[PDB]
Amino acid sequence: YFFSLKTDRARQVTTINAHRSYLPGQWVYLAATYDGQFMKLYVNGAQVATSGEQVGGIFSPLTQKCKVLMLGGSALNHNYRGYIEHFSLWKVARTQREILSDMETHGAHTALPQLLLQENWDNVKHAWSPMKDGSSPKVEFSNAHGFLLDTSLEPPLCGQTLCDNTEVIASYNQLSSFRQPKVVRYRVVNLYEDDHKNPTVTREQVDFQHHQLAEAFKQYNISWELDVLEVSNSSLRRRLILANCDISKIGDENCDPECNHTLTGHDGGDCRHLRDMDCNYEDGGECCDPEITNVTQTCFDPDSPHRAYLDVNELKNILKLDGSTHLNIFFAKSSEEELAGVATWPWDKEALMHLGGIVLNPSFYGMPGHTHTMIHEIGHSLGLYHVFRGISEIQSCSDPCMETEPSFETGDLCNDTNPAPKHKSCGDPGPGNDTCGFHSFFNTPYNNFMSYADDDCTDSFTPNQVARMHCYLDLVYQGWQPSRKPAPVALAPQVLGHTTDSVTLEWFPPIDGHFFERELGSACHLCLEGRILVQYASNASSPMPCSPSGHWSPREAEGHPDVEQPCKSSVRTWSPNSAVNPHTVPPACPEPQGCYLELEFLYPLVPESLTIWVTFVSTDWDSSGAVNDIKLLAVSGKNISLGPQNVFCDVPLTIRLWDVGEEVYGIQIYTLDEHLEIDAAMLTS
Amino acid sequence: SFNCIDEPSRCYFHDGDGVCEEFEQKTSIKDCGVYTPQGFLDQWASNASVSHQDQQCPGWVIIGQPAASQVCRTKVIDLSEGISQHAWYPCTISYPYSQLAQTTFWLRAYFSQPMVAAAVIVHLVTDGTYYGDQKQETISVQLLDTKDQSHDLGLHVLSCRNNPLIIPVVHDLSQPFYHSQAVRVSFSSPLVAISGVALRSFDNFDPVTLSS
Amino acid sequence: NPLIIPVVHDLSQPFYHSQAVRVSFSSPLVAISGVALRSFDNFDPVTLSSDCPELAVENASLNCSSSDRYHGAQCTVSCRTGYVLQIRRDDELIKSQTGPSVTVTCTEGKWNKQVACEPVDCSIPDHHQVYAASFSCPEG
Amino acid sequence: KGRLSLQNTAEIQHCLVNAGDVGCGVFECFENNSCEIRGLHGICMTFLHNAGKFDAQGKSFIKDALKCKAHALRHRFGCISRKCPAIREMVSQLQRECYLKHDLCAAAQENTRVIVEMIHFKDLLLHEPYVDLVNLLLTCGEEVKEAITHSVQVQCEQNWGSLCSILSFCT
Amino acid sequence: KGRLSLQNTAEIQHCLVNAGDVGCGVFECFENNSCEIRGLHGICMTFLHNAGKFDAQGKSFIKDALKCKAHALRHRFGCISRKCPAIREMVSQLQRECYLKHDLCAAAQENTRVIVEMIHFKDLLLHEPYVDLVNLLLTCGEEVKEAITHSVQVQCEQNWGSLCSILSFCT
Amino acid sequence: AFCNYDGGDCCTSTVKTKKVTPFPMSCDLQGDCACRDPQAQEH
Ligand SMILES: [Zn+2]
């Protein structure tokens, strides 16, 4: 928000800004005051910026009839998109107390000589007139005082979810009623051939690992229910499964330690010092066709229908299990193998999807020498960071948070966890210049599982790391536990007002955010308070740019928006130029319509609003809007067309939908930009 | 970044406000001036003399602590505003004569108390970047002393984030110390505007009066 | 024969007590007869870092009562309305943001500052005041 | 050096879609690439530097050839495999199919003296599109071939005396 | 770069008078000079590297030619004007009058396959004594000329495809 | 003016590319191949 001023006497137009990007869905009581020396701007009652450069009145009284007042736009068509509720203009400057009094009284105000105009939109034509070529804006019904208690808690500067808030994690520390014994169901995916004779992990390994897992969590009121699921498929069993090996670097000539195997061709010959078993470095289908030799022996083609290496995400796509009712554990051999595969955090979009779970090493699962490295992979799946995240995993010393002091909002976000660097030896490590802000660490948590220590020196969790464990099993993992106890109210009720006889109090909704009873096989897990269905994109499709009728399926543009930096270009978004092969030049999108993304929603509803999280835009564009067109699909086939909208990097695009009498099951976003990055979509009913 | 000053607790935003408080000195360097460290002491220039002095821009603007309220200028095209009342840029030589002739401008600011130099603070209202010309410009921070020529410190480029640019005085302890007296700042681009130069010294000890 | 290595130290960094000197080399034929260290015999910098005439200013208000103009005669100088303050300092250590006024102090028979309340300078009227008119100011 | 990845395929694509197909701006954008396909910009500059010596037929041929080459270069650079032999193949193929369909041999037959004295040694030895233009003009006309080989012989006497002294007479 | 004053004549003179005239020490001293007369040291090294392929007559010719060239380079380098064309003229003249007086054609007619298959296309173009040896050698026999032109055509098919595609047949 | 100023191709206000690219790189932009049409936006 900005407030610019330039009087007739002055020579320089001066602007006043705000302190934060504006909220695209919240009511703001904007107040601009000017007395003659200082101009002030109030956003929601707090003074944000004040400048004292403009002096005197804004015009001479001789040119009083020449000045005009415009609402919602200017003569150069600087149009406004949004709601205006109670217009008010005063002939005198009011201080902050009168601003808060006019906020708290709303528009029910009497007539005053200082009160120039106080307009509530019941008769626009009595005081306002539209443009003679334009049209008047539509009058609707809305309530500015809809809530008297803010139910939204902002996560901290280096937090990710609701329970990373300071006053919610402390409620799971002081209280003892939130740490009841909880049973969590989980599964182990065992691959077999078509004869039931060879496992990926032996049965005694699973039997030892289950008891060792329940032994380390029985003191923390956590029990695990094991349900081993066996899948018999010789196509998946005989081939190599890798987790940390990316598929782009297989085609790239840049070497990487995650992809170095005899069943990967040693990154296609791009890692060997020397640059058929040796003439297969990327024989054009001679060594990959099954009629000549076996496919798993000497085939490393990245675009072959059958190959030797298989990523864990494609294995999850093939299996397509259920993650809402169980925790899925997969296995993958990797060349790095210092850790296991990358676990899925509870704040990811893949927390309950079939692509989410824990990826482990099958040659270390159940072994007595490496039993505890599954437990650490449990802690990555339950919302616990590494202990050295505030020291070792710091990309720059000017970070928003760096754990130099124990706090609930910095580094590991646990007060009991002392700061520590990345160490492998047990005990307190030696001093070094690697740390950017400390030299001497005492009482380092070497006994915690989150360090990279060995099996013997990792024994127990700190008691501040069990509050997050008992919080994320109520926040994200409510469907895993078979207990019918609902999520409790994680915050104390707040006193709003009182009188001589009564006291009014309100409290927050329960911590999982559900406003209805948890009924399976329905849409009740997406409804909000007031019979409002808010849903994301379930299915997404886009045509291939280098193929006539490709129609590849994007995946990162479906779920809830998950971008750490909303203006830096990231990998969790859909791009027109990300659909190509890395060894192929991306083509330009066509002129009259551009490349489009087709998103599909699970429940077809009559829409009320559509929000799109456009993350990254190019610095320059031809048209004024980056998104060229938005077409709402229909069950009757009537494509409702909407023109271009100007998107911003940080603030998501929000569109209000009028007169849509047909149910919309999906949208199409037509753009001409090559590097536009759409992250998510939301259809508010 | 807020502060409330009433019994019903009305609050205000203090970073962009023009009034410095007691608590704001250690946090907001952009409103309370340059934060002097606890072991040092800053001294600002007095009797500052310039080269291209004119009626539009005189040379007494460098005296005293400059106002930190002046924001950085991002690709400034013209300087026809009232910037000379709180800063100094050359006004006799315009843009094309400076760009073609490749002349030089200097600011030979004096000081009052003769102390040793630990760092030289130069506070500018702009980086000198032009709207068309995207080439960076590098200024030189010289140093002058009593009954001797100079002790050069090098050159530095302009950064908006570091508007109070700090020049670490490079000195060997095998060489005997010197009492700094004046600071000369030289630049060839016309868009460099200097709001104020300074000199950081020791409030604990003076190493000249003892090593006579 | 003795090689002197000047010790570079930035004066923003506080001093330190040097205790040991490591000399490392890879050639086998280096023969060292003795190594020394130069210090200051005088000081340790670690423990250290552990009558003026009557002044008249035009267009101002000298509302100060320095009856004796000795070493420490604190006076205050404030300009009137429509007048801005110019400061040309002579001898000073620290500065304070007094505002529209200033404090002038006596030191060794002279005042530390030279203040001057110059009048404000309106711009020459070219445009933006009267549309399509000629301006001829007879005074200034 | 076999990948065009070293030069961002984004900035040169932006330069291609920002410029126009009338002048040498597309060839100005295309010259700074990872693979060594330099020489199209030199052909565009030299053809539009000595346009006065050509007739109306030659000037119309030059305008249509540069228009077709710029349009084809902006058209078929969309989807292609990122490797230097494929880049050489597509550039040589577009140059051949552009010069063949606009009667390069007719411009060889009309005004041969300008078109055979314009080649410069050390500007065609290391440039593949110059070699493509030279051999296509050689196959266009027999007397054009004779004149351009006379120019090649004068340039061999100018620059490199090896192949003049070695196999001056073939059989 | 037209004078041999950029490199001191005193150090190369001391190098010439210090080394012996039997080996390639004189050509080791002379190869680093201001004027680009580089290539004699390569001839001295390659002639003493493939000397086992020659017969007794060829090896005697190699010994006599290197001895005469070393003695001439130590002999007539005394009084000479210090400029690159004069140095090129005296080097070419001593090489010509040394190779003509020791029956280079007899050693060519003894074993020509070694003398035409051990030459290299790389560094032939930029070394003037290599061009002098090539353009003196082909005047001995027509079969030797045919063999060295066949080697040049093979090297064209190996390195530079310009002159293979352009004027493969002369008339 | 006899040949209708080459269809307006020599004047910036009548070219879709908003630029002037004369047939000889040797012609000066203010000489023989200049926009000498008074009906354009130059005057
Ligand atoms: Zn880990």
Numbering used by the authors:
A (entry chain B): 90 to 364, 378 to 384, 389 to 791
B (entry chain B): 900 to 1111
C (entry chain A): 1062 to 1111, 1134 to 1223
D (entry chain C), E (entry chain G): 42 to 212
F (entry chain A): 1494 to 1536
What do the authors report?
Originally discovered in the circulation of pregnant women as a protein secreted by placental trophoblasts, the metalloprotease pregnancy-associated plasma protein A (PAPP-A) is also widely expressed by many other tissues. It cleaves insulin-like growth factor-binding proteins (IGFBPs) to increase the bioavailability of IGFs and plays essential roles in multiple growth-promoting processes. While the vast majority of the circulatory PAPP-A in pregnancy is proteolytically inactive due to covalent inhibition by proform of eosinophil major basic protein (proMBP), the activity of PAPP-A can also be covalently inhibited by another less characterized modulator, stanniocalcin-2 (STC2). Here we present two cryo-EM structures of endogenous purified PAPP-A in complex with either proMBP or STC2. Both modulators form 2:2 heterotetramer with PAPP-A and establish extensive interactions with multiple domains of PAPP-A that are distal to the catalytic cleft.
